[PDB]
Design a protein around this ligand. Structure first.
Ligand SMILES: [Zn+2]
Lengths: 102, 77, 277, 92, 48, 106, 78, 93, 83, 75
DNA sequence: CCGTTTTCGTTGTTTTTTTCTGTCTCGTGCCTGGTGTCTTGGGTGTAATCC
């Protein structure tokens, strides 16, 4: 079931795009789960670091991107609302995941 | 750091300004502020364009994406 | 002959350049790689012959719209397009001038060849060119494209699938989504042959509405406007079932209802054009 | 010509505009031709709008101007709609 | 501008008059194309 | 990746020159405020003779290399390439005389 | 002077905006958009300057012209 | 007191423009809102200019340049011409 | 009396009619709820300001001018109801 | 106005019941609210239709609404 | 702040018929599969500097 994660909007997940596919990311107690073709399951034990990009320089990007690095590659989740950045970072730090902010 | 070369932007600004009043002078800080604002605007526009392109299930941004973003913002009628 | 020409639809899955030949009763496209990939088009079967120069395009075009459909490879088509592509601070400005020379060269050669096709037809085929200044943007299929009026047709030839609407075959035009401060509208063409499916052109910018209305009037096409996208699958099947009863009850003339028929208004304040205190 | 509107050939009230500019907390002092200039501009703009609203009401065979005709006039004029792009018209 | 909008709108009254003459023309040319005898000879289409 | 600023003779990474400019020549070159072409025309990655200076005031070498009025750091005895004619004229406008460090002029 | 905005500069601006692939007409489209933006902003700035009875365009004119558009800029004396 | 509105002035302007046309009450409400809104915009921008230039008086130059900022090209040109004409004739008279 | 869950008073035809006036031909079934939420968030943002004005005037009735100022603050100027 | 006048009144009162208990309303406040709400929604449906046409579709879907509200700058 | 006028907001009841829905078949558009050819990597191989 959904974990202890609650978005700024009190929602159990966040809207994001993985490549050209729009969908929902769920931060569950043991894993990150993206529920939209293609479905992506990422256990926290397999995650090396999460990199968050909020504009990579000048101009405030209203929507930020999350790159999840793991032993088999990286997944970039794009178009996440910036208000959801702090709740996601605090939850991932709470789960013992290394968060890097460019 | 600013991604446009300074002299081309200054020449463009002077070319544009010369169509409203001849013999105008610009403080260097005015050109710097204009360049900062123009790049910030263009980066925000490119972010919206990227969002539109990803919405259409593509990777390549196209002029129709720019026109749609500018229309939705309320910039083009 | 016209050399180094690509054909659409392609007879094989491989894109190959060919040579187009003028013969006594038609044209022949012939691939150099295989003799069996010939495309023969009779002058009697061409309905419309279009030429389109590189005015903004990376390509030059000779398009044949057909009366009867042909079987090119595995595809039935009414449209056969013959084309070639131009594509391959002062130095970059000069490279644009060299591209403008290459445009003008291919434009002159392909226009001349399309006129020579018209001459070889003994006056059966007129050469049409698009009026670019009268063009408007819209979505007939899945992409936004520039729709171009010609003398006798509304065309789009740059992207597949092609649009060719003959103006004389139109019975009525309907403008859908037109109402209070709307961003865009749709245009629907109904044909005189009710068995033919209606053609939709979507998202025409509202800035072009008054221009499209003027153009339809200048071409003697009746139009009507509506706030709602009327279904034509329904409308047509009812009209096909009894075309006589349809016209007996007012056809589309009654549906038009141009008369505003509005007199209720919103009352009026004491009419006094006099300075008070 | 007693009223200041007459001395300027205007229909809008110069005196009321002067009072509103003064009793409005905009600046310590007010000129003598600022109310005149502003009244002239306002009268010109209202005439500009009423011309097109009359045109639209005459294209609908109507003698009275209603919010519909004002909406049509504004959204059909390139410059007025640019001026009034962030304005909602009730019953328009 | 007022005399040009009057002129442009009188050209638009001619535009509307043409559109009305086109709707009446097509109505007459639909009643002439389809006769009550063709309606009587209704063809029922069956799945082949 | 390191480049040698032609005017003062300092050697720093080319990306450092692009992002921050020359700490000494910025009063006359505006290297940070200059595009990559101007950075290359005033900072060259092809050089010879790495020099480390600790005390500009008392080092006879710094006086001999005319770098005793600059920031201590990495410097090059010889730098490939010279300043462009337009940049030379711009510096001459400021009243500063440019002596090439290319070695071909002595 | 509008050709001074080279293709690499537009590419750089798109890369900082996160754009992965770029068409060939994007450059001309962007040049047109930038020209419109700059035209409006410089027109407002020159209006401010003429009103202040000056022949030089200051940073205050640009800052007020951006505040006029709604593009408030910090760090230039506002 | 008797509420203030620009209704009679709009009637005057209308009869000047369209003698054989009438206005509804709601259209007059809209017109009054428009006039008030434009007055507020122009006065606020004039005050902003006066403060920008360390001035304590609103003269016709501030109003003119406010009109230059707010109105688009042709509208600004015609409204500036109209205002200067009216101010000139009021001064002359 | 307390009002409970009156959002469903924005029945399917209102939303459909609003879409048709907006030019929409085919409407997905998830739209109606989407729209409802959007509208809620809008009204909550406008009303919170109108009420803020009403309470500051030390009044107990929400007037039309309070709504007009609340809209004007968001750049939503409304002609017809005063101004 | 397409929405009615009494369900909308009840919705407005229900929403207003959170910010201050037992608040009265005025002649032209609910009407203005309905006009603004319908104008806003029509503009939003215009943008949604534009996005849906952009995606080569004719059906508007919730992700088009989300994209429109994202580009408008809505939270 | 206090007294006045009288509009239009709140209250309730009856009737109409457009809108919502249960049900069916078909199709068109969403999704899976096959394929293009470009930008780029990883490697061989020829050839080399360095001490
Ligand atoms: Zn240096």
């Amino acid at each position: 079931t959904p974990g202890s994660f609650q978005s700024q909007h009190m929602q159990p997940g966040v809207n994001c795009s993985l490549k050209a596919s729009e969908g929902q990311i769920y931060l569950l107690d043991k894993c990150l789960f993206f529920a939209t073709k293609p479905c992506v399951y990422l256990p926290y034990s397999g995650i090396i670091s999460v990199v968050t990009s909020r504009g990579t320089g000048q101009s405030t990007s209203r929507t930020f991107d999350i790159e999840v690095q793991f032993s088999g590659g990286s997944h970039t989740f794009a178009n996440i609302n910036k208000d959801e950045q702090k709740p996601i970072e605090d939850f991932l730090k709470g789960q013992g995941v290394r968060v890097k902010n460019e | 750091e600013l991604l446009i070369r300074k002299l081309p932007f200054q020449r463009l600004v002077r070319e544009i300004a010369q169509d409203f009043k001849t013999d105008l002078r610009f403080q260097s800080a005015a050109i710097g502020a204009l360049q900062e604002a123009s790049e910030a605007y263009l980066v925000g526009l490119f972010e919206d364009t990227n969002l539109c392109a990803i919405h259409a299930k593509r990777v390549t941004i196209m002029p129709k994406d720019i026109q749609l973003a500018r229309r939705i913002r309320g910039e083009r009628a | 002959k016209l050399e180094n020409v690509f054909v659409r639809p392609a007879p094989d899955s491989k894109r190959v350049t060919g040579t187009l030949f003028i013969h006594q009763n038609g044209i022949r496209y012939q691939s150099p790689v295989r003799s069996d990939h010939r495309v023969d088009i009779l002058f009697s079967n061409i309905k419309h012959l279009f030429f389109q120069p590189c005015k903004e395009e990376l390509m030059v075009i000779i398009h044949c719209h057909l009366k009867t459909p042909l079987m090119i490879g595995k595809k039935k088509t009414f449209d056969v397009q013959f084309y070639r592509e131009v594509s391959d601070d002062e130095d970059e400005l000069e490279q644009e001038q060299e591209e403008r020379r290459r445009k003008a060269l291919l434009d002159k050669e392909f226009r001349r060849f399309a006129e020579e096709i018209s001459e070889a037809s003994n006056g059966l085929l007129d050469l049409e060119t698009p009026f670019r200044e009268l063009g408007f943007t819209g979505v007939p299929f899945r992409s936004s494209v520039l729709c171009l009026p010609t003398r006798d047709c509304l065309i789009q030839l740059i992207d597949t699938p092609f649009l060719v609407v003959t103006l004389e075959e139109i019975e009525v035009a309907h403008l859908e989504r037109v109402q209070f401060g709307l961003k865009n509208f749709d245009l629907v063409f109904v044909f005189k042959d009710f068995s033919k499916p209606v053609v939709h052109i979507n998202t025409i910018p509202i800035e072009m509405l008054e221009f499209v209305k003027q153009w339809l009037t200048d071409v003697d096409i009746p139009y009507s406007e509506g706030a709602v996208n009327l279904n034509w699958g329904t409308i047509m099947k009812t009209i096909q079932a009894d075309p006589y009863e349809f016209f007996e009850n007012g056809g589309w003339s009654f549906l038009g209802g141009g008369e505003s028929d509005d007199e209720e208004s919103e009352e009026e304040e004491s009419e006094f054009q006099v300075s008070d205190e | 010509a007693k009223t200041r509107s007459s001395r300027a050939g205007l229909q809008f009230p110069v005196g009321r505009v002067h009072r509103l500019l003064r009793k409005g907390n905009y600046s310590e002092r007010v000129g003598a031709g600022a109310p005149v200039y502003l009244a002239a501009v306002l009268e010109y703009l209202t005439a500009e709008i009423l011309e097109l609203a009359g045109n639209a009401a005459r294209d609908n065979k109507k003698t009275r101007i209603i919010p519909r005709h004002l909406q049509l006039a504004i959204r059909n004029d390139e410059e007025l709609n640019k001026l009034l792009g962030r304005v909602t018209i009730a019953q328009g | 501008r007022n005399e040009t909008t009057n002129t442009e709108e009188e050209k638009e009254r001619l535009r509307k008059e043409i559109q009305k003459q086109l709707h009446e023309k097509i109505q007459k040319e639909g009643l002439a194309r389809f006769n009550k005898s063709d309606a009587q000879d209704g063809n029922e289409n069956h799945a082949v | 990746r390191e480049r040698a600023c032609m005017l003062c003779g300092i050697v720093l990474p080319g990306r450092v020159f692009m992002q921050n400019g020359c700490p000494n020549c910025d009063s006359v070159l505006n290297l940070r405020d200059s595009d990559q072409a101007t950075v290359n025309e005033c900072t060259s990655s092809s050089f010879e003779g790495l020099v480390a200076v600790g005390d500009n005031e008392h080092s006879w070498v710094a006086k001999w290399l005319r770098v005793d009025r600059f920031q201590p750091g990495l410097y090059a005895v010889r730098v490939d390439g010279r300043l462009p004619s337009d940049i030379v004229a711009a510096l001459e406008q400021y009243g500063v005389y440019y002596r090439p460090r290319d070695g071909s002029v002595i | 002077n509008i050709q001074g905005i080279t293709k690499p500069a537009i590419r750089r601006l798109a890369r900082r905006g996160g754009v992965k692939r770029i068409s060939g007409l994007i450059y001309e489209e962007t040049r047109g958009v930038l020209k419109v933006f700059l035209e409006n902003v410089i027109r407002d700035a020159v209006t401010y300057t003429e009103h202040a009875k000056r022949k030089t365009v200051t940073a205050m004119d640009v800052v007020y012209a951006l505040k006029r558009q709604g593009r408030t800029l910090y760090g230039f004396g506002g | 007191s008797r509420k203030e509105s620009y209704s009679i002035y709009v009637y005057k302007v209308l009869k000047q423009v369209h003698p054989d046309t009438g206005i509804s009450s709601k259209a007059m409400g809209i017109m009054n809102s428009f006039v008030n809104d434009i007055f507020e915009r122009i006065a606020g921008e004039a005050s902003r200019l006066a403060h920008y230039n360390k001035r304590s008086t609103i003269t016709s130059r501030e109003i003119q340049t406010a009109v230059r900022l707010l109105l688009p090209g042709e509208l600004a040109k015609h409204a500036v011409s109209e205002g200067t004409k009216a101010v000139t004739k009021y001064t002359s008279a």
